[model samples]
Target chain A: NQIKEQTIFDHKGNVIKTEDREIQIISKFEEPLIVVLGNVLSDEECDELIELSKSKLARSKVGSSNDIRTSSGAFLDDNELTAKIEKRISSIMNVPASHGEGLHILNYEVDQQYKAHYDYFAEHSRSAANNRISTLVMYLNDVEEGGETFFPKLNLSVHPRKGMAVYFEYFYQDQSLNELTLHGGAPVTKGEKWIATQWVRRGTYK
Target chain B: NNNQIGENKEQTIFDHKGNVIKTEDREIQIISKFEEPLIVVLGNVLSDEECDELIELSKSKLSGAFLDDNELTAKIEKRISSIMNVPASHGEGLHILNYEVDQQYKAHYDYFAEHSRSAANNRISTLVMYLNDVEEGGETFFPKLNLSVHPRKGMAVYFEYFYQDQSLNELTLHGGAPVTKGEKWIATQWVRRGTYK
Candidate 1:
């Protein structure tokens, strides 16, 4: 049931109301297909997520290069608040919880960044058995300047704004990977940046 | 080493004004450049007043724009032609597009399909100028190139899909992201390879 081709919304799925609040759909792209969601979180929730993440922070690691991802991240366990947030995310995304990994909160201080990368695991790898299908990145706080999530190949740069989120899918219906999903977090030039991310897989995560 | 069709190829970067170029009426900031498809993002391409004036003129003409010829006023055509460095005679009518909250344009090419017969000549380049700063979402995405340009007031994104050989570059596929918050307004100018009939 989890393995299905993501239906491309030919029309905009505008303001969708969840139990928490109404989140607006910003835009949708076809290739390296993506959907930008606005106001996906509230101010209180943003602060609370940051607070819950502070104690569990650890340095983020890239696929191979540790220096590439200079931000600190915390993997949120199943708690009341986090569970609520995860439920909201899965509901909004229309995906099942079993298909999702734990919510990851990342903090990028000034000058920190993550270089371009694909969210999907490489073919034939252990993780690739349940390849990542989509990614949801919700901005917890805004950066004063230069903390933009950029899809270099797509020539798309998304500015960080509190409570907003960006989503993109990389696997097609047949489980083939989309190479056009290359993306990265640009360096935070001025203020700090906070984001809570969720990765959805095609099958139940191990 | 450089004999491959699409391997290790370098892109040519272009500046605002030079011997063959002329855009001194307004200052333009070059944000970034990609070589394969020759895409460029220009900032401050239009003055705030100019953008406002154009928006005002196009406000009432809101409707779905077409890839083919459309009725455009002489004033709009002349303004875009001068800035794009293309002859007015070679340009089609301007396309004025408006997007409300959550509205979007799907990813597709500005160029025509393989079987279709249209225009005096093929569209060579495209210039989409932003009329307003959207509060939240709404970005121009180039999927094949894996690039996306955010909408900025008075700023514009320009790219060329047709090379001198007259072949279309499939890498130019693009679309408008859905508007998340406020509305979005843009004026698109398509320049042809030859004088448009």
Candidate 2:
């Protein structure tokens, strides 16, 4: 509570000073609630996360084995570092930490890509209580060039910058799904692209 | 430009409003930095005495002001501006934000939108100082940076959005996590592109 716009001033009534800082919004959209941000990780942190995931990387999986998506993936278990990162994501997304899924790291090589797809589960498959409400895709390492998060319908493409992330919410207040949220990674044309993703639910996720 | 990591140097800011303000002689320590969008975490911005005093000041919002609002707040405003390397005149007055159980501020930017008629009035940076410790939750989070600073008494997170190119750097998206237990109190300041009235 403030005293009706009272600000700092000298006795003679001049001005003195006043401050959130840390992330930048690269882009935004209302239709599917998409936002792009930068400086989400430091080089050292990115390097550490990648090294932590190296041992856990397995063959590409998610959706189908069809050529639509191809990449190695890993899941990081709880650690002081992972806990810190999870706290950051939970707070930034305004979602309870318990509502978020574990940290999932994806590694993409030359010519590998994920076709545009929706994060929301089929209505017939899952209930609103277990629906994934939002998704945060964090770029762990910068691609030499060309790796971008692409939205086919919007024709929007965001270049991967180490420490940056793109967030989107596809579920509405009424719990209906939005097809406009379709998005995927473009092939890594120049070099490898590493990313970490966290999907949050409407309720406490197991 | 050559310097040691933990060195503290005397600095000054030109408000461009014909006013020059000095920062605290003893300053806070920078524990971490993120280069692209310019975010840093600082420690010891306030003393135990100061935190206790400000906590009472925020409580005054419901009752009457128990302490000198202008004098105490003005001192901190200038200090924060000093650390930010921005002129005191460029920032708005200090805002004392308090959060109870389950309260939060969603992800958002610090820069003013186009509705802000003058580009000069847009915010260039912001600083958040935690006045008290919460038992759990209430962290300042940067989704893009994958960064979050826990609510530690006297700790602060400083960041920038607008750049020298006169364009807004759209990467500084951040939010306040809900306070699950105890409570959260902070002093927030927004530094503008130009002298703020």
Each model's TM-score for chain A is 0.85, 0.79
* Model 1 ranges with Cα > 4 A deviation: A1-12, A56-72, A173-177, B1-197
Cα displacement (Å) at residue A140, model 2: 0.9
How well is each residue in A3-79 modelled by candidate 1, as lDDT tens digits?
32454222233555667776665545556567666668889999988887765432333122222452446677677
TM-score for each of the candidates = 0.54, 0.45
Poorly placed runs, candidate 2 (over 4 Å)? A1-21, A56-72, A126-129, A173-177, B1-197
Best candidate according to TM-score: 1
lDDT tens per residue, model 2, B1-197:
87678644222222211111234644454433444466665656877777887877767766112234477777877788778887878877777778988999899987867676755488778888888877667878877655566677777777777564333266678998888888888888888878885
Measured against the true two-chain complex, the DockQ scores of the candidates, in the order shown, are 0.06, 0.02
Chain A of model 2 scored by TM-score:
0.79
State the displacement of the C-alpha of residue B193, model 2, in Å, after optimal TM-score superposition. Answer: 31
